[PDB]
């Protein structure tokens with residue numbers, strides 16, 4: 001898992017996100033959708049967004065970004081002891097939303113990108129290492145639930 005020092009770095013980085021949850025959330029989703037247009041198709045409510053300008057102007061997209069990062073933040077604050085929080089998310093994303101684990105990889109990468117984009121020179125090598133470990137743990141624990149369900153896509 002992560003060391004206490006690594007968790008401290010993760011939660012310090014997370015304070016940056018908490019100062020503007022909606023802005024970070026919006027940028028993460030836009031990075032996901034523009035880099036991987038197939039992901040947009042999983043969202044009936046965002047399929048109509050045909051340009052990035054439309055994405056940027058969508059208040060509902062910002063709202064969903066807030067929902068997403070709020071859930072992730074709650075998980076991170078558990079420092080790995082997140083079974084109760086993570087299980088339901090894994091199960092909704094596999095069974096209802098049909099989100100392949102690859103797309104969770106994509107959004108994890110998007111989070112790292114957005115952190116550098118919004119905080120250039122202020123997301124240090126140690127911080128990137130710790131946040132990466134935290135996102136891998138999240139993804140990996142979701143993957144275990146996906147395997148239980150026999151879910152691939």
Ligand code: HEM
Nearest residue numbers: 039042043045067068069071072089092097099103104107
């Ligand atoms: C950090 C990773 C993610 C987190 C924390 C997250 C969190 C959430 C939450 C809290 C909800 C609403 C409750 C629920 O249905 O379980 C939700 C809904 C949803 N998620 Fe995710 N999600 C993540 C990644 C993804 C990805 C990568 C996709 C697709 C590429 C996706 C697709 C969806 C869809 C289609 C819904 C239903 C949206 C609606 O129509 O309201 N999620 N997500």
